Amino acid sequence: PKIHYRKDYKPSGFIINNVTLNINIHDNETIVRSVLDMDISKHNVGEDLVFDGVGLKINEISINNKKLVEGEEYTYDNEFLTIFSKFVPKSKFAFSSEVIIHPETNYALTGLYKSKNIIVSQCEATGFRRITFFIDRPDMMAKYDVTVTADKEKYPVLLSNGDKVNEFEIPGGRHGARFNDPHLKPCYLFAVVAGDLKHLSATYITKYTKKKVELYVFSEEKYVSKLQWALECLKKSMAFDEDYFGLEYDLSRLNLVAVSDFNVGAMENKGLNIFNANSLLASKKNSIDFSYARILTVVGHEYFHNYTGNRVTLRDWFQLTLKEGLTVHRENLFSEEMTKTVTTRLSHVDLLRSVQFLEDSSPLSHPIRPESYVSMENFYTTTVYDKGSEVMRMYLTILGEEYYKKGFDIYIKKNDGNTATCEDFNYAMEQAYKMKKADNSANLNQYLLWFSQSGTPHVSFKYNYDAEKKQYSIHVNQYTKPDENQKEKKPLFIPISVGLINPENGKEMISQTTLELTKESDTFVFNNIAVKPIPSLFRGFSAPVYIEDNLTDEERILLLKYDSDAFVRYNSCTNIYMKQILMNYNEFLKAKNEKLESFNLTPVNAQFIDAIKYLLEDPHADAGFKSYIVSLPQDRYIINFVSNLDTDVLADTKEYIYKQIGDKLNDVYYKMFKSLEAKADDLTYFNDESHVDFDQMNMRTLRNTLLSLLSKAQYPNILNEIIEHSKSPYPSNWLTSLSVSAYFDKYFELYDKTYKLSKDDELLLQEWLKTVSRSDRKDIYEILKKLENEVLKDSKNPNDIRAVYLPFTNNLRRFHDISGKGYKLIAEVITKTDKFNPMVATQLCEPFKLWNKLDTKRQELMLNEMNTMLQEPNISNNLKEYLLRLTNKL
Ligand SMILES: Cc1cccc(CNC(=O)N[C@@H](CC(C)C)C(=O)NO)c1C
Ligand SMILES: [Mg+2]
Ligand SMILES: [Mg+2]
Ligand SMILES: [Mg+2]
Numbered sequence: 001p002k003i004h005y006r007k008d009y010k011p012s013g014f015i016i017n018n019v020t021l022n023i024n025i026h027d028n029e030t031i032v033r034s035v036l037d038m039d040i041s042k043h044n045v046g047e048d049l050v051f052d053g054v055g056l057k058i059n060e061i062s063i064n065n066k067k068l069v070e071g072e073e074y075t076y077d078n079e080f081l082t083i084f085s086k087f088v089p090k091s092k093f094a095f096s097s098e099v100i101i102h103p104e105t106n107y108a109l110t111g112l113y114k115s116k117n118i119i120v121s122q123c124e125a126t127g128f129r130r131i132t133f134f135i136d137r138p139d140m141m142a143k144y145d146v147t148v149t150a151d152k153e154k155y156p157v158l159l160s161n162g163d164k165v166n167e168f169e170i171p172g173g174r175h176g177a178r179f180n181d182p183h184l185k186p187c188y189l190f191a192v193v194a195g196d197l198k199h200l201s202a203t204y205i206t207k208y209t210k211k212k213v214e215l216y217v218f219s220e221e222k223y224v225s226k227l228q229w230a231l232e233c234l235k236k237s238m239a240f241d242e243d244y245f246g247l248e249y250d251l252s253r254l255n256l257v258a259v260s261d262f263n264v265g266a267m268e269n270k271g272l273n274i275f276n277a278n279s280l281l282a283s284k285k286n287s288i289d290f291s292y293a294r295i296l297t298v299v300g301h302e303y304f305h306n307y308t309g310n311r312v313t314l315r316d317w318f319q320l321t322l323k324e325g326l327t328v329h330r331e332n333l334f335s336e337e338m339t340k341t342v343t344t345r346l347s348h349v350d351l352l353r354s355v356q357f358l359e360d361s362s363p364l365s366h367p368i369r370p371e372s373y374v375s376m377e378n379f380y381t382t383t384v385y386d387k388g389s390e391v392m393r394m395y396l397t398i399l400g401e402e403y404y405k406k407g408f409d410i411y412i413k414k415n416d417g418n419t420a421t422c423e424d425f426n427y428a429m430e431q432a433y434k435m436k437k438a439d440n441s442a443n444l445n446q447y448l449l450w451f452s453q454s455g456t457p458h459v460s461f462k463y464n465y466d467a468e469k470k471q472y473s474i475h476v477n478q479y480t481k482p483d484e485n486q487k488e489k490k491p492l493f494i495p496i497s498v499g500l501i502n503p504e505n506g507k508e509m510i511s512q513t514t515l516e517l518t519k520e521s522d523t524f525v526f527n528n529i530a531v532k533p534i535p536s537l538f539r540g541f542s543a544p545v546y547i548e549d550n551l552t553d554e555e556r557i558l559l560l561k562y563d564s565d566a567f568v569r570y571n572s573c574t575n576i577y578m579k580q581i582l583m584n585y586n587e588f589l590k591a592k593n594e595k596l597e598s599f600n601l602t603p604v605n606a607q608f609i610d611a612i613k614y615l616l617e618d619p620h621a622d623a624g625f626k627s628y629i630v631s632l633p634q635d636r637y638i639i640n641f642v643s644n645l646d647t648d649v650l651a652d653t654k655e656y657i658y659k660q661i662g663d664k665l666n667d668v669y670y671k672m673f674k675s676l677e678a679k680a681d682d683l684t685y686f687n688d689e690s691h692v693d694f695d696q697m698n699m700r701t702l703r704n705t706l707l708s709l710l711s712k713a714q715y716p717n718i719l720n721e722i723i724e725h726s727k728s729p730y731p732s733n734w735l736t737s738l739s740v741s742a743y744f745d746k747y748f749e750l751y752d753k754t755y756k757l758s759k760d761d762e763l764l765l766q767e768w769l770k771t772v773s774r775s776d777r778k779d780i781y782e783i784l785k786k787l788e789n790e791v792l793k794d795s796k797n798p799n800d801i802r803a804v805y806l807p808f809t810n811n812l813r814r815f816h817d818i819s820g821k822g823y824k825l826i827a828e829v830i831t832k833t834d835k836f837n838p839m840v841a842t843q844l845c846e847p848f849k850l851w852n853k854l855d856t857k858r859q860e861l862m863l864n865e866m867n868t869m870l871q872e873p874n875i876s877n878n879l880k881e882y883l884l885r886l887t888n889k890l
């Protein structure tokens with residue numbers, strides 16, 4: 001279809017200086033009256049004036065109070081309004097339009113829409129054009145004066161960006177409010193909300209200027225008591241940006257608003273952040289533990305955009321990673337500091353190495369700054385976001401904390417109030433880098449390849465120790481696989497954070513150092529290394545790469561036990577698991593294909609199993625860490641290492657491994673499950689929505705992981721423990737009782753009990769839906785059909801749709817049924833959903849991303865469903881672009 005290219009970027013021939021809106025909300029229509037105070041830029045060459053405007057019903061068009069007429073001075077085709085150049089003035093002018101739109105039937109949740117009884121907007125990326133005409137792109141920065149009117153009884157709270165400057169009554173039971181947002185902004189940061197909303201509020205005093213900021217968080221009345229953690233997390237985010245970056249908030253007021261129907265997590269509209277209710281609302285008796293982490297990171301992320309996205313914005317959409325990667329990095333820094341648990345960093349690594357590495361070896365592979373797009377919407381990707389953040393975090397690793405803060409400050413100062421590009425950020429970091437090296441010839445020109453080159457680098461190692469010289473060498477190689485974006489791949493600037501562990505006593509042998517690999521290969525030599533070390537490589541996960549440590553399992557075990565760095569310990573464990581998984585996978589696959597009547601499996605390493613026991617029995621070791629060591633790598637991590645994957649054979653492989661370990665450790669697992677109870681489920685802070693003990697949350701996580709293992713093993717009398725756990729007041733515990741009960745006939749009683757506990761809270765019923773959807777059940781397909789008919793019905797709430805289907809698609813055995821019925825079922829949902837919400841339909845395609853990694857029968861089934869979906873008449877441009885790229889047609 002229509003393809004935009006990065007190299008084709010040109011500034012506009014026009015400038016929009018001021019936007020003055022009247023948004024008049026009525027029962028069956030919203031009327032939008034808009035004045036744009038415009039001018040011609042220095043780049044103008046007498047061209048037609050072309051506005052974006054999608055699905056708008058025009059009442060009137062004028063320029064300087066002169067009415068323009070369809071077919072004579074303009075054309076409109078439901079996408080673009082063209083004003084012929086003859087009637088475009090040559091100096092300052094006022095463009096006026098009035099259009100009609102229909103929030104009430106906008107089920108796509110982009111533009112102006114209705115979520116339950118709340119009228120709300122979503123404008124990023126290209127939603128403003130669905131409200132009114134605009135040059136709808138992020139370099140068209142302007143100031144906004146916004147009046148909203150509505151029925152007073154139905155819509156008493158009216159909000160738009162900035163200072164509320166007047167409130168007034170209107171005949172017929174209506175009323176209005178006017179806002180002035182003094183900060184120049186692109187139109188994707190416009191927002192408006194109208195509803196019967198309740199709030200909590202507080203005053204925050206900024207650290208340096210002592211500015212008073214009123215903080216408001218809003219929801220529908222039913223869930224006002226679920227707003228407190230959000231408000232606290234906002235106070236935390238504000239203090240962190242002050243403390244780490246020196247950044248203060250810059251309006252007198254900041255509103256956060258929860259709505260039930262939202263396509264993603266939240267949105268950074270200036271002074272008016274709008275959230276999926278699942279990422280703003282919690283209470284301890286009606287939310288699982290993970291809701292608290294999600295709210296903290298999502299509130300954080302939107303707050304951090306106030307500088308990284310708002311005060312410094314994007315020149316064009318190809319720069320998305322500049323705000324999202326950098327904001328993800330700020331959010332992860334925030335989250336690591338607020339949680340103070342090593343699991344937080346690990347969880348970011350886990351997400352990258354599963355979901356993002358898969359994307360990066362898929363036909364969807366792109367660099368973090370793409371070269372082209374059809375729907376910009378399809379480039380809000382784990383690549384742009386999570387690889388983006390790892391790339392932004394490497395600057396911190398390379399520079400250190402003080403020179404990182406210096407380079408960041410150069411960036412944010414220089415480009416304040418303006419657009420920026422990835423080059424501008426690298427330029428700023430390069431200034432810091434020269435200062436740190438004390439050499440004005442040092443440069444970061446090689447660093448740009450992190451923005452332009454797709455694919456995951458493979459970093460491999462060889463070691464040599466000379467005992468006479470006490471000298472140790474690490475020889476390092478990097479390789480990125482050629483792909484459709486580059487047929488030849490260049491070496492990157494890869495920072496390798498390293499230590500060296502003495503295997504005799506388990507201690508540190510050097511001060512930690514960062515090796516700067518800039519070539520295809522290099523050898524780093526260390527002197528005064530008193531015995532042969534074991535290397536601790538890529539500490540903290542210091543670059544976004546496949547690590548081939550070339551260590552034995554014996555050396556990996558010593559790192560798991562004695563290394564200081566949590567990532568290296570975890571990764572060493574991960575590698576032991578992977579070696580075992582690939583070996584047994586190959587054993588089962590050969591036996592299956594050869595139709596063998598007998599064959600052998602390589603047992604799980606017995607010293608590894610002893611090391612897992614020793615960690616678990618250590619009462620001073622971290623409980624979150626322990627939950628990571630007893631869990632195999634995720635399926636989407638594993639698939640990155642297998643071509644032609646038989647999912648059945650993998651499910652058999654994983655079961656054998658877990659069985660082998662549990663045959664040794666179940667008694668330890670049980671004993672720990674019981675000993676952890678007192679501290680794990682202690683009710684300190686249970687009534688305090690302003691404080692969360694993350695260490696204690698990790699103890700519950702560990703208890704629940706162990707309970708799953710023991711349930712699946714049918715450990716004696718474990719059902720009793722399951723029934724007791726179902727009575728815990730923590731929903732994390734009592735929903736776990738449901739999933740782990742899948743292995744017993746009590747499942748359907750716990751299904752009904754947990755349903756009853758869940759059904760009167762919108763968000764809790766959604767967590768119940770996911771718990772059911774991921775239940776390890778033989779009858780999962782009949783359970784899905786029960787969810788559809790009894791609970792989902794014909795809901796258009798993306799949270800409901802996502803809750804029912806996505807966890808099921810991670811069921812390795814059932815979703816990949818060799819019949820293809822899983823693939824068919826999800827395809828039908830995608831196509832159904834695409835007729836009203838193209839964005840959500842494409843999110844539901846995620847399970848197909850690995851199609852060309854599967855065995856050839858499963859490839860064929862997925863491929864047939866994808867081509868079928870592509871044959872759907874009126875398929876959205878979103879879904880079509882996605883499926884065309886995914887099936888190697890584009
Ligand atoms: C396809 C799609 C669907 C919904 C929303 C958008 C605009 N994106 C947006 O607000 N992105 C979030 C990311 C989400 C996972 C929450 C963001 O970074 N907000 O700051 C897009 C582009
Ligand atoms: Mg319309
Ligand atoms: Mg996150
Ligand atoms: Mg609902």
Ligand SMILES: [Zn+2]
Nearest residue numbers: 301305324327
């Ligand atoms: Zn963001």
